[PDB]
């Protein structure tokens, strides 16, 4: 069964479908995990931050992209 969790959506006031915006009741974990995900897509987005990160290890660029890419699922830790 279930009880009373019927909340499909409501008045389309602004449609903040941009993920990562956040509202008043947004906790520390939520906007820090959006902060880490935006950081990761900007790391692999720019070529040259990915250069800078690949020089610091000896790892190749696809190794660094696969590491950064698999960390985007749960980067900060469990809620």
Partner 1 sequence: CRRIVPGQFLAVDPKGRAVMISAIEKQKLVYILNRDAAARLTISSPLEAHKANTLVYHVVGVDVGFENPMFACLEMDYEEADNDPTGEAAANTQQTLTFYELDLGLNHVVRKYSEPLEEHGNFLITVPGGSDGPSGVLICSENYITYKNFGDQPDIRCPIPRRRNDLDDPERGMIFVCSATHKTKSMFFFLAQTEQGDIFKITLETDEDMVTEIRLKYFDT
Partner 2 sequence: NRFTVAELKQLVARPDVVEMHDVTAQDPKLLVHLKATRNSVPVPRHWCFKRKYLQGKRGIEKPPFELPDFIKRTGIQEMREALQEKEEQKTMKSKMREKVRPKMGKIDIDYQKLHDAFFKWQTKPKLTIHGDLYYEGKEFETRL
Partner 3 sequence: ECLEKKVDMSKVNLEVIKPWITKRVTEILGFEDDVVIEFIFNQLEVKNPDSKMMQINLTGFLNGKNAREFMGELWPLLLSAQENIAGIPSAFLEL
Residues near partner 2, by CB under 8 A: 25, 27-28
Q: Residue 53 in contact with residue 29, Cβ under 8 Å?
A: no
Of 26, 35, 41, 57, the one binding partner 1 (CB under 8 A) is: 41
**Minimum gap (Å) between residue 12 Cβ and partner 1:** 16
| DSSP state letter for 7 | -
Mask of contacts with partner 1, 56-75, x by CB under 8 A? ---xxxxx-xx--xx-xxx-
Q: How far is the CB of 29 from partner 2 (least distance, A)?
A: 10
Burial of 68 (0-12, 13-18, 19+ CB in 10 A): middle
What token pair was written down for 37? 């995900």
């Amino acid at each position: 069964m279930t009880d009373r969790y019927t909340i499909h959506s409501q008045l389309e006031h602004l449609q903040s479908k941009y993920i990562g915006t956040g509202h008043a009741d947004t906790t520390k974990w939520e906007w820090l995990v959006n902060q880490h995900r935006d950081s990761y897509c900007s790391y692999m987005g720019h070529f040259d931050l990915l250069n800078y990160f690949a020089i610091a290890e000896n790892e190749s660029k696809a190794r660094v992209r696969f590491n950064l890419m698999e960390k985007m699922l749960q980067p900060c830790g469990p809620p």
